[PDB]
């Protein structure tokens, strides 16, 4: 039938079928999420390993369509050591009437951060990892991209302890790493993301999810029990929300951070470990703060004693990305427009 489909073959992984470029051999399950399986493969042309992620009908609805087009143009134009890089993107379907599936070829990593967070970690690993996220987060903010939803399962690390953030977050508009300012519908700024480094840092020290909220109501309550009800000066955004679930929600005074993260959680091996426990618990104190007025900046967190041991201009001052589309966060189309919009992104 076709010269062009002699360039593809099909491999079955569970119920999923991957129809990929024949350069990609030895496909194998290496992880899964709600969008399906991701595979390890060998690129016979590049003679290296890769990760391959399939998006089945990225334009099924409009919010997914915006998220697919957004993750495509940005991965196309963000080149940073701590951001996952796109190696190729393709579709096996021969035209837009037939266009259905999108395959993203990215670099191959060893695991995600959930598989490290459950582990035991010394200050040198923890601070090195967090420093790496702050470098990735800082690179995104240079170009105007506020992640707003970093989570340990969408960050991958490698056995030499390097780290790459997988996604770019939500388009402008389980909540366990979501900052108060976006779970309560205020405005947000770049340091919205500092809150989420805070929950991951806290997660690494304590050993399990800090604020695992069952609902959208339990997620705010389980924050204030530990951190205490916020200040009257903080009550902004909508006035309906001002009274709502707050003014008489049972008053909470949080616990101290000496009490939230006791020296039990850290190793008091040396004087050096006594000093690093102290510094880290102080860094938390500045990221796990409800009022963003009083929350640290990314640049300040990168110059923090716990974190600035690793400082080097190479990765902390990179050349900012050149996002070709500016309305990217504000485009609003129909499913058919998104489809052709996503298609010619795959096809140029």
């Amino acid at each position: 039938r076709s010269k062009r489909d002699n360039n593809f073959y099909s491999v079955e992984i569970g119920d999923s079928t991957f129809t990929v470029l024949k350069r990609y051999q030895n496909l194998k399950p290496i992880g899964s999420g709600a969008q399906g399986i991701v595979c390890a493969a060998y690129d016979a042309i590049l003679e290296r390993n890769v990760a391959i992620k399939k998006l089945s009908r990225p334009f099924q609805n409009q919010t997914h369509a915006k998220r697919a087009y957004r993750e495509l143009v940005l991965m196309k134009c963000v080149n940073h050591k701590n951001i996952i890089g796109l190696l190729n993107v393709f579709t096996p379907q021969k035209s837009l009437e037939e266009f259905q599936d999108v395959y993203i070829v990215m670099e191959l990593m060893d695991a995600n951060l959930c598989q490290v967070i459950q582990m035991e970690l010394d200050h040198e690993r923890m601070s090195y990892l967090l420093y790496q996220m702050l470098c990735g987060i800082k690179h995104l903010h240079s170009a105007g991209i506020i992640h707003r939803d970093l989570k340990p399962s969408n960050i991958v690390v490698k056995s030499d302890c390097t780290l790459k953030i997988l996604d770019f977050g939500l388009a402008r508009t389980t909540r366990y790493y979501r900052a108060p300012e976006v779970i309560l519908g205020m405005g947000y700024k770049e340091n919205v993301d500092i809150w989420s480094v805070g929950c991951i840092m806290g997660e690494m020290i304590k050993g399990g999810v800090l604020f695992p909220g069952t609902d959208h109501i339990d997620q705010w309550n389980k924050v204030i029990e530990q951190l205490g009800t916020p200040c009257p000066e903080f009550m902004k955004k909508l006035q309906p929300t001002v009274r709502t679930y707050v003014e008489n929600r049972p008053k909470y005074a949080g616990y101290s951070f000496e009490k939230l993260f006791p020296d039990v959680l850290f190793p008091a091996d040396s004087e050096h470990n006594k000093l690093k426990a102290s510094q880290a618990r102080d860094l938390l104190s500045k990221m796990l703060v409800i009022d963003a007025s009083k929350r640290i900046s990314v640049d300040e967190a990168l110059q923090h004693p716990y974190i600035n041991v690793w400082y080097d201009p190479s990765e902390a001052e990179a050349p900012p990305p050149k996002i070709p589309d500016k309305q990217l966060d504000e485009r609003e189309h129909t499913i058919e427009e998104w489809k052709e919009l996503i298609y010619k992104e795959v096809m140029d």
Partner: protein
């Protein structure tokens, strides 16, 4: 004109400062273990 050199295979990176190379070599030496 940058005398202090990292010796890692595949890294030709050079440092003008002694301390700055120190953390760079330590960065190559790191590892972590995980469970799927």
């Amino acid at each position: 004109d940058k005398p202090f050199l990292c010796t890692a295979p595949g890294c030709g990176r050079r440092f003008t400062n002694e301390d700055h190379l120190a953390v760079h070599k330590r960065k190559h030496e790191m590892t972590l273990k995980f469970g799927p």
